[PDB]
Amino acid sequence: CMFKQFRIGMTYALDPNIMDVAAATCMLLFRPAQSISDEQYRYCLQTMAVFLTNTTYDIVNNDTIDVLKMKLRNQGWPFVERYNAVEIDMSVEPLRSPGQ
Amino acid sequence: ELIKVPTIPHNLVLIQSDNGKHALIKEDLGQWPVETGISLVNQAGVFAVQLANKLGIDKPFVLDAGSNYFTDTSFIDTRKYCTDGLSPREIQKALNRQRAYYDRPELTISENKTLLSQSIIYPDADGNDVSIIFSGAMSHAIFTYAQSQWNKNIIKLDDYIREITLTVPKQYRPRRFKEIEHTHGYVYRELNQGSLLPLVDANLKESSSYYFKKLMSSISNVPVDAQHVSMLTNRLTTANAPTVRAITVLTCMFKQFRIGMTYALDPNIMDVAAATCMLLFRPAQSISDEQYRYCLQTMAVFLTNTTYDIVNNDTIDVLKMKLRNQGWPFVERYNAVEIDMSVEPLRSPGQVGRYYNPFNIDPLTKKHVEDRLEEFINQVQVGRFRNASGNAVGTTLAAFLRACRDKTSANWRGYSVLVSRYRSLIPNELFESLRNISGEYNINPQDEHSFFFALAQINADDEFIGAIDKESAEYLDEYATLARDISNSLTLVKAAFGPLERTSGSIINHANNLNKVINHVFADKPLISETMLKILTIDGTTGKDGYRNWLDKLVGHNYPVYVEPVVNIMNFISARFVADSSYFGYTNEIMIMPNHINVPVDDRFGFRDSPFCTSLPRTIMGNDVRRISYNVFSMMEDIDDVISEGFILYDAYFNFSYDIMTTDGVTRLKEDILIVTDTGNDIKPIHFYIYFENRNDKKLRYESKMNVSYRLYIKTPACLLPLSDYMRAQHDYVSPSSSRVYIKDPAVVYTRS
Amino acid sequence: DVPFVQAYSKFADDNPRHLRVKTGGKMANALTNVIRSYYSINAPAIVPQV
Amino acid sequence: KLFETSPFDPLTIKNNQDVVDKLYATQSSSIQEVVPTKTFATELQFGVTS
Amino acid sequence: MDVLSKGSLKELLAHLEKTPLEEAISYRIGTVPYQNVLISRNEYYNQLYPDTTSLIDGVSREGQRNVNGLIMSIISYVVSGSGHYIPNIGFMLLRRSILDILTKHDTGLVTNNLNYGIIARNLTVSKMNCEQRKRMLICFKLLAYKDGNQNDYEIYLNQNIPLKQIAPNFIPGDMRTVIHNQDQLAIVGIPAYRLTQSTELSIRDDNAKSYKLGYVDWYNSNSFLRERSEFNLIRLKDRDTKYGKLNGW
């Protein structure tokens, strides 16, 4: 939250379980979209597709984000998008220093 | 590991006379005996490894001599004086003693500073530090060449990563190197992949059996989730479920892994169910044409109520037509759909790997590859079979087919993941080469049906995935060892053995030479690792015997073998051994002359009756010197007349040693020149006692003319060097920059854990 | 011939061999080509800077 | 205090390698992007020896 | 922005392979290329700031319909990041890659009568910097080899001494030459110096600084691709490999 340049990543198992999907959806909901990269976004979509839809990682490889979103929406999964975080405007009182 | 060499092996000594008039620089590389009558190159190779051991260049190394320096006390010096090599102080003392003999002034301050500053260490543009020192010519040439060969494998860390990016899977967490390792990180990797084909092609049965057993010992440990109808319920079994599961993975993991089923003599409704399940839920690549017929014949025998005799001569097309007319639509084998691997397979640079999807399920469609499966099941339900009005056979077969179809459609993804993981373990060459030559994994008809009827979900927990990660490291180690063993064995065959003719002499020669190689190879530490021995002893033969047959096959091979750096280092030393023989204590010819004959000799070193010549004289007193081969000289019975004139002995390798004595005396040999026996002549071992010369000693002059009657002359060794030419011993060594970090574990990912 | 072998190896990046012409290696080709380009601007500059 | 535990003592190091080894020893004190575990290798070759 | 960030010849040539010609076209009306205008730069002066519009800019400009305009719009895209407005180009051309337009005969464009001196004047060469001129010479060389007018490329280089010195050295048909090139062709990138958010006077300079500051934001955005931290997440096609080769070549 303090530094925009930092990022959040994950690594799931070859066969995702219900926890892997739970972890993936918790990140896309309650973490800044500026922290999750495009490549991490596709991986989070892929691990959800492998569990919710009957498919393996090799099949969903070379699949674009739009195709993965269509696959999950048809199955009935609505959590397929990233959410941006609002910027809170902060000031530090000067005291002896000039202030920031 | 990559070893670091602190000091440079100059291999130099300084010998000066007592009075100081004469001094020389000698390079001592040792004495190596050479046997005549056999190939010299083969002996050179043995001595090359020992020479490399002496110089410390056998194992991969990087020279660090940059810190071997000191700084003078002068203000304007600001130069680094190298400690390695022959110190200029010794040359200064030798030169000063020489000047004392001639009553010349000692070296002045200006020349002292120039001489003592000859050895320096200075940096180059690239950041390396160059050491200029006094060292031998052959020591410099061998050391610098081995430095070049090892440096080819030292590459930057970023370059190494770029080579292994394609092989890295997605499940593993990336590794964060330190910022120093990214800028100044270097690794030592061979980066050449030898082919495994020579072992696999020669022994297809033994190699395939070894890998199939190893894979099946692990797949069988996978965690899993827990009237005619009466007949098929009784045959249901589970005790052999782990075996059939692994056979299923193996069929989908390899290109052509053929399995067979042996039906009962009297086919039952069990047999038709097993035939239908295999023809439907197994890859067409794993089904042979013969097994296609035998499965078709079993269907016709039971459904058409016909015995095996009539259908034994029927072709495939005739059987299909006969079955289709009766009402059986399941007469075709279906090709599996190949799924491309996400990453490039191991030991397959720039190649794409693929595996068959289990149970003949299309990944894009997620149902069976046959689009008429539901229509076909309907026909079986309503069809009339066994030439009977009752429909008991038809309805019960449709019920089992529906259960098998439902079971496969729900458990297919779990088996696909298992096949994908185990396919990544084997390289591409093994995927295309391994065959089921011996039918050691046949499936019973009851096992085939019970496996598909009672299919169970594959549970991929953390323990199983963690276990496979351990096996992946073990598999990678095994492939590397076999490639090294194959490369070593391919080099041995080319150098040792040759072609074979239809003569008893050739066969006897081949058999005896082969046994000598095997005995030497397996003595002390064996040349071949235990992994290759396990493969070659699968049949039952011992390790020595299994290796022996493989070597015979490899004779005459055209397999390309990559030239590793240590091959070039030994080859370079072997060439210098033959070319420069005097450096190592042996020569190709000697001269025996009487004392009264005056021969031109080397006079640079100030030796009294020097036994060295710049080159052996072509003519003496206007006539060419007689040359006799050693074998002819050994059989000579008129030797007393021949040695009166003088001759040159050649066509042999002569080992000699010399001891330079500081004092003055008669230069003589330790033993007599020749020994005369009834069974031939011979030359006794050559050892020289060389003394420095004072021209005005009348006593030692008369002894040389009178006491010794014959003298032996050899070409002057090239290791000797006069002191006045000490600048010819200046040589340059380059050491890499001190700001380099070497990474022992260059792996780029971590285990998920 | 060790001093000649070492000198030729540094100049040509390849060990001297019998039954070979001893051209000069890659360094000879570069020197020959840069001489061509120095004479006039119509000559091609075909030596990579690497 | 800028650090709870210093990354390394500058007076103890002598070359670039010493800094790398010290950084690996003290990496447990810092917040790590990836906590190290057993490495996984996908590339291994053994060369011929002397 | 993406094109201006390409540093090596390999990266730039790879980008021209993926990018279709439609990105070179702008679809926006723009204004007349060469015109003396008065612009507002209030950070420095109260009086309006005189300047002259040019084809090499980050904004759309009107371009001629002929093959000359299409070539110029491609070059302006490479050196400035924005193309020109050429109305009603066929869909066949728009789906072709930029490299195919410059180095293939399959397209129906005829370029044999191209004059390099006229193009260099229209896309003002006295105003470009060294990196922009190097990129232009790459486009000229690709056109010459496809057309067989390699001599016309050499005569043009001999008439301009500074261009000959900085001319990139590669063979448009051999990949080994591309890999060996050490030229740097990055107009925008991470700045070693301190880069502020102040405006600039000239249209070219102010437009270039907009791309420079935009790339820094794009560098720290989630769309940027970090190789050292996410290399296993990349597709095999887009992963950095030593054996990567352009089609043909």
CSV table of N, CA and C in Angstrom, one decimal, chain B residues 204-322:
chain,number,residue,atom,x,y,z
B,204,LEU,N,17.9,-52.4,-26.5
B,204,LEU,CA,16.5,-51.8,-26.4
B,204,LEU,C,15.7,-52.6,-25.3
B,205,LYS,N,15.9,-53.9,-25.2
B,205,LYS,CA,15.2,-54.7,-24.3
B,205,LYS,C,15.6,-54.4,-22.8
B,206,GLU,N,16.9,-54.3,-22.6
B,206,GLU,CA,17.3,-54.1,-21.2
B,206,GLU,C,17.1,-52.7,-20.8
B,207,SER,N,17.3,-51.7,-21.6
B,207,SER,CA,17.0,-50.3,-21.3
B,207,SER,C,15.6,-50.0,-21.0
B,208,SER,N,14.7,-50.5,-21.9
B,208,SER,CA,13.3,-50.3,-21.7
B,208,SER,C,12.7,-50.9,-20.5
B,209,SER,N,13.2,-52.2,-20.2
B,209,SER,CA,12.8,-52.8,-19.0
B,209,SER,C,13.2,-52.1,-17.7
B,210,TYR,N,14.4,-51.5,-17.7
B,210,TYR,CA,14.9,-50.8,-16.6
B,210,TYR,C,14.0,-49.5,-16.3
B,211,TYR,N,13.7,-48.7,-17.3
B,211,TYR,CA,13.0,-47.5,-17.1
B,211,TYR,C,11.5,-47.8,-16.8
B,212,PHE,N,10.9,-48.8,-17.5
B,212,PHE,CA,9.5,-49.1,-17.2
B,212,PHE,C,9.3,-49.5,-15.8
B,213,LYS,N,10.3,-50.3,-15.2
B,213,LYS,CA,10.2,-50.8,-13.9
B,213,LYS,C,10.3,-49.6,-12.9
B,214,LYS,N,11.3,-48.7,-13.2
B,214,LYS,CA,11.5,-47.6,-12.3
B,214,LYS,C,10.3,-46.7,-12.2
B,215,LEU,N,9.7,-46.4,-13.4
B,215,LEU,CA,8.5,-45.5,-13.4
B,215,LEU,C,7.4,-46.2,-12.7
B,216,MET,N,7.2,-47.5,-12.9
B,216,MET,CA,6.1,-48.2,-12.4
B,216,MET,C,6.2,-48.5,-10.9
B,217,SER,N,7.4,-48.5,-10.3
B,217,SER,CA,7.6,-48.6,-8.9
B,217,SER,C,7.1,-47.3,-8.2
B,218,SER,N,6.9,-46.2,-8.9
B,218,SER,CA,6.4,-45.0,-8.3
B,218,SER,C,5.0,-44.6,-8.7
B,219,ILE,N,4.5,-44.9,-9.9
B,219,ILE,CA,3.1,-44.7,-10.2
B,219,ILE,C,2.2,-45.6,-9.4
B,220,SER,N,2.6,-46.8,-9.1
B,220,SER,CA,1.8,-47.7,-8.3
B,220,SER,C,1.6,-47.2,-6.9
B,221,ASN,N,2.3,-46.2,-6.5
B,221,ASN,CA,2.2,-45.7,-5.1
B,221,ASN,C,1.4,-44.4,-5.0
B,222,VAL,N,0.7,-44.1,-6.1
B,222,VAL,CA,-0.1,-42.9,-6.1
B,222,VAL,C,-1.3,-43.0,-5.1
B,223,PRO,N,-1.5,-42.0,-4.3
B,223,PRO,CA,-2.7,-42.0,-3.5
B,223,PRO,C,-4.0,-42.0,-4.3
B,224,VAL,N,-5.0,-42.7,-3.9
B,224,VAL,CA,-6.2,-42.8,-4.6
B,224,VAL,C,-7.4,-42.7,-3.6
B,225,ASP,N,-8.5,-42.3,-4.2
B,225,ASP,CA,-9.7,-42.0,-3.4
B,225,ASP,C,-10.7,-43.3,-3.5
B,226,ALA,N,-11.1,-43.8,-2.3
B,226,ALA,CA,-11.9,-44.9,-2.3
B,226,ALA,C,-13.4,-44.6,-2.8
B,227,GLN,N,-26.6,-65.6,-13.9
B,227,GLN,CA,-26.9,-64.5,-14.8
B,227,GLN,C,-25.6,-63.8,-15.3
B,228,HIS,N,-25.7,-63.1,-16.5
B,228,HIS,CA,-24.6,-62.5,-17.0
B,228,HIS,C,-24.1,-61.3,-16.1
B,229,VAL,N,-25.0,-60.6,-15.5
B,229,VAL,CA,-24.6,-59.5,-14.6
B,229,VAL,C,-23.9,-60.1,-13.4
B,230,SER,N,-24.5,-61.3,-12.9
B,230,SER,CA,-23.8,-61.9,-11.7
B,230,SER,C,-22.4,-62.4,-12.1
B,231,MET,N,-22.2,-62.9,-13.4
B,231,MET,CA,-20.9,-63.3,-13.8
B,231,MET,C,-19.9,-62.2,-13.8
B,232,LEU,N,-20.3,-61.0,-14.3
B,232,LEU,CA,-19.3,-59.9,-14.3
B,232,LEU,C,-19.2,-59.2,-13.0
B,233,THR,N,-20.1,-59.4,-12.1
B,233,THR,CA,-19.9,-58.9,-10.7
B,233,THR,C,-18.9,-59.8,-9.9
B,234,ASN,N,-18.9,-61.1,-10.2
B,234,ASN,CA,-18.0,-62.0,-9.6
B,234,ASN,C,-16.6,-61.8,-10.0
B,235,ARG,N,-16.4,-61.6,-11.3
B,235,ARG,CA,-15.0,-61.3,-11.8
B,235,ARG,C,-14.4,-60.0,-11.3
B,236,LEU,N,-15.2,-59.1,-10.8
B,236,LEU,CA,-14.7,-57.8,-10.3
B,236,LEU,C,-13.6,-58.0,-9.3
B,237,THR,N,-12.5,-57.3,-9.4
B,237,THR,CA,-11.4,-57.4,-8.5
B,237,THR,C,-10.7,-56.1,-8.4
B,238,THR,N,-9.9,-55.9,-7.3
B,238,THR,CA,-9.2,-54.7,-7.0
B,238,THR,C,-7.8,-54.9,-6.6
B,239,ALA,N,-7.4,-56.1,-6.4
B,239,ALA,CA,-6.0,-56.4,-5.8
B,239,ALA,C,-4.9,-56.0,-6.8
B,240,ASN,N,-5.2,-55.9,-8.1
B,240,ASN,CA,-4.3,-55.5,-9.2
B,240,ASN,C,-4.5,-54.1,-9.7
B,241,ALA,N,-5.3,-53.3,-9.0
B,241,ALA,CA,-5.6,-52.0,-9.4
B,241,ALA,C,-4.3,-51.1,-9.6
B,242,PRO,N,-3.4,-51.1,-8.6
B,242,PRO,CA,-2.2,-50.2,-8.8
B,242,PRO,C,-1.4,-50.6,-10.1
B,243,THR,N,-1.3,-51.8,-10.4
B,243,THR,CA,-0.6,-52.2,-11.6
B,243,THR,C,-1.2,-51.7,-12.9
B,244,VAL,N,-2.5,-51.8,-13.0
B,244,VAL,CA,-3.2,-51.4,-14.2
B,244,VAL,C,-3.2,-49.9,-14.3
B,245,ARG,N,-3.2,-49.2,-13.2
B,245,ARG,CA,-3.2,-47.7,-13.2
B,245,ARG,C,-1.9,-47.2,-13.9
B,246,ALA,N,-0.8,-47.9,-13.5
B,246,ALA,CA,0.5,-47.5,-14.0
B,246,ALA,C,0.7,-47.8,-15.5
B,247,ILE,N,0.2,-49.0,-15.9
B,247,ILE,CA,0.2,-49.3,-17.3
B,247,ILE,C,-0.6,-48.3,-18.1
B,248,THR,N,-1.7,-47.8,-17.5
B,248,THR,CA,-2.4,-46.7,-18.2
B,248,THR,C,-1.6,-45.5,-18.4
B,249,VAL,N,-0.8,-45.1,-17.4
B,249,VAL,CA,0.0,-43.9,-17.5
B,249,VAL,C,1.1,-44.2,-18.5
B,250,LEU,N,1.7,-45.3,-18.5
B,250,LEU,CA,2.8,-45.6,-19.4
B,250,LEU,C,2.4,-45.6,-20.8
B,251,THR,N,1.2,-46.1,-21.1
B,251,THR,CA,0.7,-46.0,-22.5
B,251,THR,C,0.5,-44.6,-23.0
B,252,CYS,N,0.1,-43.7,-22.1
B,252,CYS,CA,-0.1,-42.3,-22.5
B,252,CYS,C,1.2,-41.5,-22.3
B,253,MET,N,2.2,-42.0,-21.7
B,253,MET,CA,3.5,-41.3,-21.5
B,253,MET,C,4.5,-41.5,-22.7
B,254,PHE,N,4.5,-42.7,-23.3
B,254,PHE,CA,5.4,-43.0,-24.3
B,254,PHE,C,4.7,-43.0,-25.7
B,255,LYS,N,5.5,-42.9,-26.7
B,255,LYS,CA,4.9,-42.8,-28.1
B,255,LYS,C,4.3,-44.2,-28.5
B,256,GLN,N,5.0,-45.3,-28.3
B,256,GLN,CA,4.5,-46.6,-28.7
B,256,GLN,C,4.9,-47.6,-27.6
B,257,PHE,N,3.9,-47.8,-26.7
B,257,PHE,CA,4.0,-48.7,-25.6
B,257,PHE,C,2.8,-49.7,-25.7
B,258,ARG,N,3.1,-50.8,-26.4
B,258,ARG,CA,2.0,-51.8,-26.8
B,258,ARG,C,1.8,-52.8,-25.7
B,259,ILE,N,0.6,-53.0,-25.3
B,259,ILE,CA,0.2,-54.0,-24.3
B,259,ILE,C,-0.7,-55.0,-25.0
B,260,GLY,N,-0.8,-56.2,-24.4
B,260,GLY,CA,-1.6,-57.3,-24.9
B,260,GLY,C,-2.5,-57.9,-23.8
B,261,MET,N,-3.6,-58.5,-24.3
B,261,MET,CA,-4.5,-59.2,-23.4
B,261,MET,C,-4.7,-60.6,-24.0
B,262,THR,N,-4.7,-61.6,-23.0
B,262,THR,CA,-4.9,-63.0,-23.4
B,262,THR,C,-6.2,-63.4,-22.9
B,263,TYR,N,-7.2,-63.5,-23.8
B,263,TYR,CA,-8.5,-64.0,-23.4
B,263,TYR,C,-8.6,-65.5,-23.1
B,264,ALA,N,-9.7,-65.9,-22.5
B,264,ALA,CA,-9.9,-67.3,-22.2
B,264,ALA,C,-10.1,-68.1,-23.5
B,265,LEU,N,-9.9,-69.4,-23.4
B,265,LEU,CA,-10.2,-70.3,-24.5
B,265,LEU,C,-11.6,-70.3,-24.9
B,266,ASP,N,-12.5,-70.3,-24.0
B,266,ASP,CA,-14.0,-70.1,-24.2
B,266,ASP,C,-14.4,-68.7,-23.9
B,267,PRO,N,-14.6,-67.8,-24.9
B,267,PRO,CA,-15.0,-66.4,-24.5
B,267,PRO,C,-16.3,-66.4,-23.8
B,268,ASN,N,-16.3,-65.4,-22.8
B,268,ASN,CA,-17.4,-65.2,-21.9
B,268,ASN,C,-17.9,-63.7,-22.1
B,269,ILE,N,-19.0,-63.4,-21.5
B,269,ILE,CA,-19.4,-62.0,-21.6
B,269,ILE,C,-18.4,-61.1,-20.9
B,270,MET,N,-17.6,-61.7,-20.0
B,270,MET,CA,-16.4,-61.0,-19.5
B,270,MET,C,-15.5,-60.6,-20.6
B,271,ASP,N,-15.2,-61.5,-21.6
B,271,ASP,CA,-14.2,-61.2,-22.6
B,271,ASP,C,-14.7,-60.1,-23.5
B,272,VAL,N,-16.0,-60.1,-23.9
B,272,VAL,CA,-16.5,-59.1,-24.8
B,272,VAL,C,-16.4,-57.7,-24.1
B,273,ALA,N,-16.7,-57.6,-22.8
B,273,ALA,CA,-16.6,-56.4,-22.1
B,273,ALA,C,-15.2,-55.9,-22.1
B,274,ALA,N,-14.2,-56.7,-21.8
B,274,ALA,CA,-12.8,-56.3,-21.8
B,274,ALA,C,-12.3,-55.9,-23.2
B,275,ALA,N,-12.8,-56.6,-24.2
B,275,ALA,CA,-12.4,-56.2,-25.6
B,275,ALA,C,-13.0,-54.8,-25.9
B,276,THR,N,-14.2,-54.6,-25.6
B,276,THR,CA,-14.8,-53.3,-25.9
B,276,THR,C,-14.2,-52.1,-25.1
B,277,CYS,N,-13.8,-52.4,-23.8
B,277,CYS,CA,-13.2,-51.3,-23.0
B,277,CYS,C,-11.8,-51.0,-23.6
B,278,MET,N,-11.0,-52.0,-23.9
B,278,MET,CA,-9.7,-51.7,-24.5
B,278,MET,C,-9.7,-51.0,-25.8
B,279,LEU,N,-10.6,-51.4,-26.7
B,279,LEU,CA,-10.7,-50.8,-28.0
B,279,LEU,C,-11.3,-49.4,-27.9
B,280,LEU,N,-11.9,-49.0,-26.8
B,280,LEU,CA,-12.6,-47.7,-26.6
B,280,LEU,C,-11.7,-46.8,-25.8
B,281,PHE,N,-11.2,-47.3,-24.7
B,281,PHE,CA,-10.5,-46.4,-23.7
B,281,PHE,C,-9.0,-46.6,-23.7
B,282,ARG,N,-8.4,-47.0,-24.8
B,282,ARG,CA,-7.0,-47.1,-24.8
B,282,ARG,C,-6.5,-46.5,-26.2
B,283,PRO,N,-5.3,-45.9,-26.2
B,283,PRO,CA,-4.8,-45.3,-27.4
B,283,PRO,C,-4.7,-46.3,-28.5
B,284,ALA,N,-5.0,-45.9,-29.8
B,284,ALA,CA,-4.8,-46.7,-30.9
B,284,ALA,C,-3.3,-47.0,-31.2
B,285,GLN,N,-2.4,-46.1,-30.7
B,285,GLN,CA,-1.0,-46.3,-30.9
B,285,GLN,C,-0.5,-47.5,-30.0
B,286,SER,N,-1.1,-47.7,-28.9
B,286,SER,CA,-0.7,-48.8,-28.0
B,286,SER,C,-1.3,-50.1,-28.4
B,287,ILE,N,-2.2,-50.2,-29.5
B,287,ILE,CA,-2.8,-51.4,-29.9
B,287,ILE,C,-2.2,-51.8,-31.2
B,288,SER,N,-1.6,-53.0,-31.3
B,288,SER,CA,-1.1,-53.5,-32.5
B,288,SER,C,-2.1,-54.1,-33.4
B,289,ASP,N,-1.8,-54.3,-34.7
B,289,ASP,CA,-2.7,-54.8,-35.7
B,289,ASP,C,-3.1,-56.2,-35.3
B,290,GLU,N,-2.2,-57.0,-34.8
B,290,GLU,CA,-2.5,-58.4,-34.4
B,290,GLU,C,-3.5,-58.4,-33.2
B,291,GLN,N,-3.3,-57.5,-32.2
B,291,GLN,CA,-4.2,-57.4,-31.1
B,291,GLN,C,-5.5,-56.9,-31.5
B,292,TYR,N,-5.6,-56.0,-32.6
B,292,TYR,CA,-6.8,-55.5,-33.1
B,292,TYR,C,-7.7,-56.7,-33.6
B,293,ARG,N,-7.0,-57.6,-34.4
B,293,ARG,CA,-7.7,-58.8,-34.9
B,293,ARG,C,-8.2,-59.7,-33.8
B,294,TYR,N,-7.3,-60.0,-32.8
B,294,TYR,CA,-7.6,-60.9,-31.7
B,294,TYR,C,-8.8,-60.4,-30.9
B,295,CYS,N,-8.8,-59.1,-30.6
B,295,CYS,CA,-10.0,-58.5,-29.9
B,295,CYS,C,-11.2,-58.6,-30.8
B,296,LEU,N,-11.1,-58.4,-32.1
B,296,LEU,CA,-12.2,-58.5,-33.0
B,296,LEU,C,-12.8,-59.9,-33.1
B,297,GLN,N,-11.8,-60.9,-33.1
B,297,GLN,CA,-12.3,-62.3,-33.2
B,297,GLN,C,-13.0,-62.7,-32.0
B,298,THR,N,-12.6,-62.2,-30.8
B,298,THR,CA,-13.3,-62.6,-29.5
B,298,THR,C,-14.7,-62.0,-29.6
B,299,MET,N,-14.9,-60.8,-30.1
B,299,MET,CA,-16.2,-60.2,-30.2
B,299,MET,C,-17.1,-61.1,-31.1
B,300,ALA,N,-16.6,-61.5,-32.2
B,300,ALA,CA,-17.4,-62.3,-33.2
B,300,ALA,C,-17.7,-63.6,-32.6
B,301,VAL,N,-16.8,-64.2,-31.9
B,301,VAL,CA,-17.0,-65.6,-31.4
B,301,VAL,C,-18.2,-65.7,-30.5
B,302,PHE,N,-18.3,-64.7,-29.5
B,302,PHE,CA,-19.3,-64.7,-28.5
B,302,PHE,C,-20.7,-64.2,-29.1
B,303,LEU,N,-20.6,-63.1,-29.8
B,303,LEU,CA,-21.8,-62.4,-30.3
B,303,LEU,C,-22.5,-63.2,-31.4
B,304,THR,N,-21.7,-63.8,-32.3
B,304,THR,CA,-22.2,-64.5,-33.5
B,304,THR,C,-22.4,-66.0,-33.2
B,305,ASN,N,-22.0,-66.5,-32.0
B,305,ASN,CA,-22.0,-67.9,-31.6
B,305,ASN,C,-21.3,-68.8,-32.6
B,306,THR,N,-20.1,-68.3,-32.9
B,306,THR,CA,-19.2,-69.1,-33.8
B,306,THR,C,-17.9,-69.4,-33.1
B,307,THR,N,-17.3,-70.5,-33.5
B,307,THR,CA,-16.1,-70.9,-32.8
B,307,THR,C,-14.9,-70.3,-33.6
B,308,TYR,N,-13.7,-70.4,-33.0
B,308,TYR,CA,-12.5,-69.7,-33.5
B,308,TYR,C,-12.1,-70.2,-34.8
B,309,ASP,N,-12.5,-71.4,-35.2
B,309,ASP,CA,-12.0,-72.0,-36.5
B,309,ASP,C,-12.3,-71.2,-37.7
B,310,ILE,N,-13.6,-70.8,-37.8
B,310,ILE,CA,-14.0,-70.1,-39.0
B,310,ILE,C,-13.4,-68.7,-39.1
B,311,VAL,N,-13.3,-68.0,-37.9
B,311,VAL,CA,-12.8,-66.6,-37.9
B,311,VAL,C,-11.3,-66.5,-37.9
B,312,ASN,N,-10.6,-67.7,-37.8
B,312,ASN,CA,-9.1,-67.6,-37.8
B,312,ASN,C,-8.5,-67.1,-39.1
B,313,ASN,N,-9.2,-67.4,-40.2
B,313,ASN,CA,-8.7,-66.9,-41.5
B,313,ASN,C,-9.3,-65.6,-42.0
B,314,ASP,N,-10.3,-65.0,-41.2
B,314,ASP,CA,-10.9,-63.8,-41.6
B,314,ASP,C,-10.0,-62.6,-41.4
B,315,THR,N,-10.0,-61.7,-42.4
B,315,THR,CA,-9.2,-60.5,-42.3
B,315,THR,C,-9.9,-59.4,-41.4
B,316,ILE,N,-9.3,-58.3,-41.3
B,316,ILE,CA,-9.9,-57.2,-40.5
B,316,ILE,C,-11.2,-56.7,-41.0
B,317,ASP,N,-11.2,-56.5,-42.3
B,317,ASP,CA,-12.4,-56.0,-43.0
B,317,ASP,C,-13.6,-57.0,-42.9
B,318,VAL,N,-13.3,-58.2,-43.1
B,318,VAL,CA,-14.4,-59.3,-43.1
B,318,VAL,C,-14.9,-59.4,-41.7
B,319,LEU,N,-14.1,-59.3,-40.7
B,319,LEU,CA,-14.6,-59.4,-39.3
B,319,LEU,C,-15.4,-58.2,-38.9
B,320,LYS,N,-15.0,-57.0,-39.4
B,320,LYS,CA,-15.8,-55.8,-39.1
B,320,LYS,C,-17.2,-55.9,-39.8
B,321,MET,N,-17.2,-56.3,-41.0
B,321,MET,CA,-18.5,-56.5,-41.7
B,321,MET,C,-19.4,-57.5,-41.0
B,322,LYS,N,-18.8,-58.6,-40.6
B,322,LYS,CA,-19.6,-59.6,-39.9
B,322,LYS,C,-20.2,-59.1,-38.6
